[PDB]
């Protein structure tokens, strides 16, 4: 049946296989007519040099412009021949190439896919075309303020690290960019073991690996070096950044402090504190009777339009903080509230509200787990993160670990009397000076 | 685990159930009442009603309710369209009973307290506004008016003089008017039938009354052009399509994938769509065209929604429209259709494979049929489409009264008389 305890038990398990040249293989059988076929690569901007900045990004567009065996636009005209959707995306710490398809024609898919991973048509016809679009887009990118401030946010904390830099990279490089340097980074980090493969669907494991087998047993896809594994712990900057522009109607805010990396015990312990403190938006039907003190007040006096809290844990790093939007005269009061919640947690919190947080995260956890692609998608990062580990039922056990002291003792570390980072975007001016925020981190006991 | 179990009642309300193994345990509740069922003085009610969700039941104080769902960790949802409003809720495998019980009290036990009703007056706009970020949003709503007279022409949103207009009572009737155990349909997912089967007949047997179906929507075309400040004019051309649940509805559902391009590849301008290609060839730099097909119970509409720049729109329309002619003239590609069939079948299954989406697909059949059809049968029926069908299907869209909706800077904007 479906019973929460038993519900953990029966799931198609994590599968793993390993080829010779460093490629990883893995899978799970969902008993489904379709399969998400995907690839995840850990080559980051944090690898990328100061010219390489944004190049892989530029590269990202290029694959589908045609390839070696398949010149321009011969690539998709086979893809849509099947009617299988196709998509690709990248990130500072990862890049994911993937396919969503019926399990039938997969024998082409990966073979189609494997071609793309390395064999590529590098043709300055597409280059200039794509060189333009990005430049076109580079300027357009000022239209969504959300992404904008985060760029400021990193650069203010991580200044002096490749992690602190634009994903698309600065503009002039894109013009200056030449496809040989790509071929470098093409050659550099697209080797295995850097490469990782997974999939989920009616596929099981074997019948994946056999038809994994030889390209990309393989086409090398190698293992040599690129030194090893070139990375560094990044510096964390108590600081502030402000772009003051008063014309605009509203002013975003972001505030955060650094935290533990991907792999780390406490990462889960802090999953709940956010869920507990929750979030608010203009548009809810929750009104003023919600349990979240923020969603209660921020709806009550509409001290903000909306806000949400984020977590981002890098390899070695993690990011805890919120993002809110409030009236140009309403900024202060959002804050003096927001320091209330974090601070009061670190001392006076209570096991009751723990539970309501506890349940939610269980739900959200179980929730996201439906669907081919997301299932498929966990593996790739997880592999690049914790390896094969999909400790599904364990996560539950992990949930049972968290305690009142725990959360307090955890937050005591990462909040009480620290140096926060401050990002801002106009019409900021109301926003108090740092020296307030700083004194405002540690209570005086009030 | 166990496959689709759907059960007629004496009330005729289908209680459909499956058994899952998953700890996610959800339930959903469908109702026939859409915007078409609002009257000239009843306007926006459902749209307002759709914000009646969180309010004070007759079974409990809304406070207790709201603090109830969170501390449990469950989640509530509400959804409507021009036709079928749907009340969705979900929580952990274990606790559904507490939550499930409240699903009734809302739909079972209304209370409209004149004070509690007032605070929701401010709310509509802020909701109503954010939907109109998307220009296409505003464009569509206008369209149902142009092509109809009465029913589907009804907005999903509140015309603004209608704002202060709505009393608790007006709601209160439409509550019980359009509610009945004949129309109500309940769907379980992760929960066993008998538990589902138990309480279903218990509370949910009420009347009777009113499904009132007097809305045939009477397709009546025309065109509407709003003068606006956008640089990218938006417009669409529609000759009425057929009713839902028909090979024609499938034929157009096939006919779309002919020209109709959703991107199957990121950023890729879809070449297999001749429409964009046959356009983009003779045409100049940015623009977009996609084909619009939608059907409701009694009927639906087929069209294509264009986005272009100031001068281009007509030729953007015309060529594409002229390109439509090409198809209507006896142009055919069986493999393309075949590929399109492959697209559709996949696109269908890829659509359906999603449970929550399929959760709708369950009751979307129910209020329509009340039975279940394996997608296989669909996939079979997908095959059943003849080409001359899709041939003459498009011919219809050419062969019949067509309608336009246009908004933006209109200086160069042609009418349908230019067409």
């Amino acid at each position: 049946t479906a019973t929460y305890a038993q519900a953990l038990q029966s799931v198609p398990e994590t599968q793993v296989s390993q080829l010779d040249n460093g490629l990883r293989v893995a899978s799970e059988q969902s008993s489904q007519p379709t399969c998400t076929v995907g690839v995840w690569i850990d080559a980051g901007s944090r690898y990328e040099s100061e010219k390489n900045n944004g190049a892989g990004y530029f590269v990202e567009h290029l694959a589908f412009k045609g390839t070696k065996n398949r010149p321009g636009n011969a690539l998709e005209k086979e893809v849509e021949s099947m009617g299988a959707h196709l998509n690709a995306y990248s990130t500072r710490e990862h890049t994911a190439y993937y396919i969503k398809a019926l399990s039938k024609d997969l024998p082409k898919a990966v073979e189609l896919l494997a071609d793309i991973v390395q064999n590529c048509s590098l043709e300055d016809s597409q280059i200039e075309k794509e060189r333009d679009v990005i430049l076109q887009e580079l300027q357009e990118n000022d239209t969504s303020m959300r992404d904008v401030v985060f760029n400021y946010l990193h650069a203010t904390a991580f200044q002096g690290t490749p992690l602190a830099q634009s994903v698309e990279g600065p503009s002039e490089n894109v013009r200056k960019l030449s496809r040989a340097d790509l071929t470098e980074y093409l050659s550099r980090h697209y080797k295995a073991p850097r490469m990782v493969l997974a999939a989920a669907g009616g596929l099981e494991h074997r019948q994946l690996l056999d038809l994994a087998q030889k390209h990309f047993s393989g086409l090398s896809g190698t293992y040599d070096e690129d030194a090893v594994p070139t990375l560094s712990p990044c510096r964390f900057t108590g600081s502030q950044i402000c772009h003051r522009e008063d014309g605009l109607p509203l002013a975003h805010v972001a505030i955060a402090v650094e935290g533990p990396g991907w792999a780390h015990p406490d990462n889960v312990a802090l999953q709940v504190a956010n869920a507990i403190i929750g979030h608010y938006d203009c548009t809810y039907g929750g009104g003023a009777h919600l349990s979240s003190p923020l969603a209660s007040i921020a709806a009550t006096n509409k001290l903000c339009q909306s806000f949400q809290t984020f977590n981002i844990c890098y390899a070695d790093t993690g990011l805890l903080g919120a993002h809110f939007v409030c009236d140009h005269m309403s900024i202060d009061d959002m804050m003096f509230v927001l320091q209330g919640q974090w601070m009061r947690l670190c001392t006076s919190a209570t096991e009751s509200e723990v539970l309501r947080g506890k349940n939610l995260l269980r739900n959200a956890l179980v929730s996201h787990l439906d669907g081919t692609t997301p299932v498929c998608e966990d593996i790739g990062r997880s592999l690049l993160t914790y390896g094969r580990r999909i400790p599904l039922a364990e996560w539950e056990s992990r949930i049972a670990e968290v305690d009142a002291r725990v959360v307090r003792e955890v937050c005591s570390k990462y909040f009480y009397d620290q140096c926060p980072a401050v990002a801002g975007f106009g019409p900021i001016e109301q926003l108090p000076d740092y020296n307030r925020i700083r004194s405002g981190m540690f209570w005086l006991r009030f | 685990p166990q496959d689709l179990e759907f059960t007629r009642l004496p009330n005729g309300l289908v209680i459909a159930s499956l058994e899952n193994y998953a700890p996610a345990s959800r339930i959903g509740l469908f109702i026939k009442a859409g915007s078409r069922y609002e009257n000239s003085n009843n306007l926006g009610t459902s749209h307002l009603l759709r914000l009646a969700s969180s309010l004070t039941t007759k079974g409990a104080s809304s406070f207790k309710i709201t603090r109830g769902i969170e501390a449990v960790g469950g989640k509530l949802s509400v959804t409507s369209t021009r036709e079928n409003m749907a009340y969705t809720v979900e929580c952990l495998r274990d606790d559904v009973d507490i939550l499930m019980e409240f699903l009734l009290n809302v739909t079972t036990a209304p209370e409209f307290r004149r004070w509690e009703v007032a605070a929701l007056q401010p709310q509509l706009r802020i909701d109503k506004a954010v939907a109109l970020q998307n220009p296409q949003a505003h464009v569509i709503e206008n369209l149902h008016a142009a092509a109809y007279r009465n029913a589907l022409a009804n907005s999903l949103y509140c015309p603004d003089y209608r704002i202060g207009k709505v009393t608790p009572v007006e709601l209160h009737d439409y509550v019980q008017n359009h509610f009945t155990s004949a129309r109500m349909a309940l769907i379980g997912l992760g929960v066993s039938h008998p538990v589902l089967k138990q309480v279903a007949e218990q509370f949910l047997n009420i009347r009777g009354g009113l499904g009132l179906s007097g809305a045939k929507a009477k397709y009546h075309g025309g065109e509407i052009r709003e003068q606006n400040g956008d640089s990218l004019v938006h417009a669409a051309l529609v000759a009425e399509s057929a009713a839902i649940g028909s090979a024609e509805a499938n034929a157009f559902s096939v006919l779309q994938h002919v020209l109709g391009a959703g991107p199957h590849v990121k950023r890729g301008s879809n070449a297999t769509s001749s429409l964009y290609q046959a356009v983009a060839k003779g045409v100049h730099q940015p623009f977009d065209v996609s084909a619009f097909n939608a059907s409701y119970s009694d009927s639906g509409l087929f069209g294509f929604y264009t986005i272009s720049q100031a001068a281009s729109a007509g030729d953007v329309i015309k060529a594409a429209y002229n390109q439509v002619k090409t198809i209507a003239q006896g142009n055919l590609s069986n493999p393309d259709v075949q590929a399109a069939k492959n697209k559709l079948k996949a696109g269908y299954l890829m659509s359906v494979e999603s449970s929550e989406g399929f959760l709708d697909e369950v009751g979307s059949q129910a209020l329509a049929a009340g039975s279940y059809t394996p997608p296989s049968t669909v996939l079979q029926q997908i095959d059943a489409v003849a080409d001359a069908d899709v041939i003459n299907a498009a011919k219809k869209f050419v062969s019949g009264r067509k309608s336009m909706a246009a908004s933006g800077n209109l200086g160069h904007t042609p009418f349908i008389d230019e067409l």
Partner: peptide, 18 residues
């Protein structure tokens, strides 16, 4: 094209889609 579309109100999130 579209389904055509939908609307959403509910509780914890909020949105509109097509």
């Amino acid at each position: 094209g579209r389904p055509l579309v939908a609307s959403v109100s509910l509780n914890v999130p909020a949105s509109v889609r097509y």
